Design an enzyme around this catalytic site. Structure first.
Site: not given
Ligand SMILES: [Cl-]
Ligand SMILES: [Cl-]
Ligand SMILES: [Cl-]
Ligand SMILES: [Cl-]
Ligand SMILES: [Cl-]
Ligand SMILES: [Rb+]
Ligand SMILES: [Rb+]
Ligand SMILES: [Rb+]
Ligand SMILES: [Rb+]
Ligand SMILES: [Rb+]
Length: 164
Positions: A11, A20, A32, A104, A117, A132
């Site tokens: 990040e 972002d 965010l 996150f 998945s 996957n």
């Protein structure tokens, strides 16, 4: 390597509001602020989050403060989510970090939607799960980070993050 170091690589750290990878106003270590196109809306969210008049700028300590909140809340939320909790608890501590990383980035609801998945992960079918996971908007839009996260799930090692 640990979840904090992992997410700090993925990040970055910025002390001023920026957009972002999705074009959304963010600050700190992937915090965010809003999906609104209004910078004023994002600034109001920021001031609320930190408890002062920032007009779009925070300190490193403040960024780290939001980051630990966000990591703590991602773990806590996983453990309260009926789809994600069993998978989290079934995984070793390294692979758990990959799951926290996904939450996150895309939120709990988004990760909980990776039904197939998640099943493969719970089954410890690592190579199948990795295949996957890549068939996703997620992977297409952020392929190099998704590759790192997927390698972490596939291997249960930090090889994709040593040394970034
Ligand atoms: Cl507000
Ligand atoms: Cl917040
Ligand atoms: Cl497999
Ligand atoms: Cl597949
Ligand atoms: Cl990427
Ligand atoms: Rb970022
Ligand atoms: Rb984020
Ligand atoms: Rb804007
Ligand atoms: Rb566990
Ligand atoms: Rb689903």
């Amino acid at each position: 390597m640990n979840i904090f170091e992992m997410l700090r690589i993925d990040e970055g750290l910025r002390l001023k509001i920026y957009k972002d990878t999705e074009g959304y106003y963010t600050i700190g270590i992937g915090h965010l602020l809003t999906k609104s196109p209004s910078l004023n809306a994002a600034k109001s969210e920021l001031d609320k989050a930190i408890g002062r008049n920032c007009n779009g700028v925070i300190t490193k300590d403040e960024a780290e403060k939001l980051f630990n909140q966000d990591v703590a809340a991602a773990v806590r939320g996983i453990l309260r989510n009926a789809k994600l909790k069993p998978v989290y608890d079934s995984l070793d501590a390294v692979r758990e970090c990959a799951l926290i990383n996904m939450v996150f980035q895309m939120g709990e609801t988004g990760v909980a939607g990776f039904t197939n998945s998640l099943r493969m992960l719970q089954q410890k079918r690592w190579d199948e799960a990795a295949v996957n996971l890549a068939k996703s908007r997620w992977y297409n839009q952020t392929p190099n980070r998704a590759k790192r996260v997927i390698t972490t799930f596939r291997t249960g090692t930090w090889d994709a993050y040593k040394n970034l």
